[PDB]
Amino acid sequence: THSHGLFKKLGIPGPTPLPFLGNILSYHKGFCMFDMECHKKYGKVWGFYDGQQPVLAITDPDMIKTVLVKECYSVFTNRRPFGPVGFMKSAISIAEDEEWKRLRSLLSPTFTSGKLKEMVPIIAQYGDVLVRNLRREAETGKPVTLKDVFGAYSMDVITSTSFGVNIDSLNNPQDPFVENTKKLLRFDFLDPFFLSITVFPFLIPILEVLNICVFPREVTNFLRKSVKRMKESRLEDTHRVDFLQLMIDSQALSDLELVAQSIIFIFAGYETTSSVLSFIMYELATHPDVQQKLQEEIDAVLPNKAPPTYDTVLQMEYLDMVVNETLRLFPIAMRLERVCKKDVEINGMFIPKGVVVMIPSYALHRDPKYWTEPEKFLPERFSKKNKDNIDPYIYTPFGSGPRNCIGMRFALMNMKLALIRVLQNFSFKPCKETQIPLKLSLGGLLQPEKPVVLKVESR
Ligand code: HEM
Numbered sequence: 001t002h003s004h005g006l007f008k009k010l011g012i013p014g015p016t017p018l019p020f021l022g023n024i025l026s027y028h029k030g031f032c033m034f035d036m037e038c039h040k041k042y043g044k045v046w047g048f049y050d051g052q053q054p055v056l057a058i059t060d061p062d063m064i065k066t067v068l069v070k071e072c073y074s075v076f077t078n079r080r081p082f083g084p085v086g087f088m089k090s091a092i093s094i095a096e097d098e099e100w101k102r103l104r105s106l107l108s109p110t111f112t113s114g115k116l117k118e119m120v121p122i123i124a125q126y127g128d129v130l131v132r133n134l135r136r137e138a139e140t141g142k143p144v145t146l147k148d149v150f151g152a153y154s155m156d157v158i159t160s161t162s163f164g165v166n167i168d169s170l171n172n173p174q175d176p177f178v179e180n181t182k183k184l185l186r187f188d189f190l191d192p193f194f195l196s197i198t199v200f201p202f203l204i205p206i207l208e209v210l211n212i213c214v215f216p217r218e219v220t221n222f223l224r225k226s227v228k229r230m231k232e233s234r235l236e237d238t239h240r241v242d243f244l245q246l247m248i249d250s251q252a253l254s255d256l257e258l259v260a261q262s263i264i265f266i267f268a269g270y271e272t273t274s275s276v277l278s279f280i281m282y283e284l285a286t287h288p289d290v291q292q293k294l295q296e297e298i299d300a301v302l303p304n305k306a307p308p309t310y311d312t313v314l315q316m317e318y319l320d321m322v323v324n325e326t327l328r329l330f331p332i333a334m335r336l337e338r339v340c341k342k343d344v345e346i347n348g349m350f351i352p353k354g355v356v357v358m359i360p361s362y363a364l365h366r367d368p369k370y371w372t373e374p375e376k377f378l379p380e381r382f383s384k385k386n387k388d389n390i391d392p393y394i395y396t397p398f399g400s401g402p403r404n405c406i407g408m409r410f411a412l413m414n415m416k417l418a419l420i421r422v423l424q425n426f427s428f429k430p431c432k433e434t435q436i437p438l439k440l441s442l443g444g445l446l447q448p449e450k451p452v453v454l455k456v457e458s459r
């Protein structure tokens with residue numbers, strides 16, 4: 001018939017698909033590894049099939065600019081359909097075509113230089129609570145789980161910035177806001193579920209009517225009333241122009257359409273920030289020279305363990321180098337994807353309506369062809385002297401083009417703002433429980449398989 005015939009017929013190379021599964025079984029080593037191997041084997045372009053769905057992997061920087069930038073609105077506007085979303089259909093990251101265009105520009109005003117600057121003092125409160133929590137754990141001497149302390153900070157930041165609600169999470173070890181969020185996705189291919197959709201996608205519209213989800217009305221009802229609650233607050237006291245505010249501004253934004261974005265943003269700013277800071281501390285711990293060289297810049301730009309400011313945060317060139325370099329090793333997203341909504345030729349390559357075009361970020365970031373010593377943590381590769389030798393289309397930890405990460409500037413600041421405080425008070429040391437080297441899990445979340453547990457000493 002067809003479907004599986006597509007890449008042989010187009011003469012694009014790739015792994016031979018099995019009936020029904022496609023190349024699904026090759027995800028056994030995780031898909032970054034699968035991607036790494038494909039790159040090595042097939043070169044600049046290749047195809048494969050998630051079940052019956054053709055995916056075209058592309059690695060040329062030109063071709064990548066075309067799909068992410070030059071042809072975003074015209075052909076490549078949406079990501080692959082998600083799996084049973086429900087009312088989350090309207091969440092910006094899941095929305096398509098014109099629905100997305102109106103939400104993008106209704107929400108993009110949230111992350112503007114001035115807005116972040118107003119979040120600066122707000123975080124400079126949750127900064128202090130991170131340390132005072134850590135200082136109690138520097139007493140014992142025995143091992144700290146970064147994901148836990150950092151996850152509780154990030155929660156605090158997002159709930160407070162976007163919403164104006166101080167939920168005190170750092171002075172609340174037991175908290176439902178964080179414990180429901182972390183259980184929002186079990187994206188796992190060893191788990192039959194997301195596996196039994198990206199191979200049984202015909203079963204997606206089956207699940208819509210069954211009202212079943214990727215967070216089964218367990219997490220979403222918490223926030224369906226918890227964000228219904230933060231919503232009344234503003235509608236009552238005749239303050240600040242934030243996320244929760246600028247969504248109240250538009251009320252053509254509806255009600256479950258407001259919640260949906262909140263849920264995105266609550267999740268997004270909890271799981272990323274915390275996963276990346278965990279990665280940064282792992283690298284700083286296992287590279288003490290780099291940890292110090294940074295403690296030095298922080299001390300130089302901010303003497304007497306001074307309170308970080310917006311302006312000073314952008315001064316710290318080595319910090320940014322450290323962050324970018326961790327994000328080179330751990331692009332938390334792994335791949336960027338854009339469904340091709342009409343037949344198209346790009347940079348001299350035919351691509352048929354319906355195909356998913358995929359940019360393997362994790363592979364590009366590790367390309368032995370492009371990066372000298374690509375598995376080594378080498379912050380110096382992002383120096384003024386070297387930074388420009390770096391292709392914004394090979395290095396893409398935040399995606400690119402109109403559909404790139406709405407949360408980028410906030411994330412970078414948020415992270416930098418925590419790191420500053422954390423390092424201007426403590427040093428981090430590997431202990432016996434620390435996994436050296438760090439190995440990644442095989443799920444669809446770029447994560448360490450053992451949590452990063454380190455040692456904390458005062459200064
Ligand atoms: C280190 C932290 C973060 C990283 C590495 C990251 C990375 C990414 C990537 C790679 C994408 C896809 C963009 C594309 O494919 O072109 C993305 C999209 C997105 N990110 Fe993030 N992100 C981070 C933090 C955040 C935060 C804190 C928020 C919350 C404000 C956020 C909200 C989003 C949204 C809403 C999208 C979808 C954008 C759209 O389709 O309009 N991200 N992010």
Ligand SMILES: CC(C)(C)OC(=O)N[C@H](CSCCC(=O)NCc1cccnc1)Cc1ccccc1
Binds near residue numbers: 187263267332405445
């Ligand atoms: C809908 C829900 C909030 C449950 O989650 C997602 O949006 N689904 C995607 C799965 S990846 C999980 C998070 C991660 O490790 N990295 C990516 C990320 C998440 C949020 C914001 N920025 C980056 C998440 C997703 C969202 C946008 C683009 C691609 C993936």
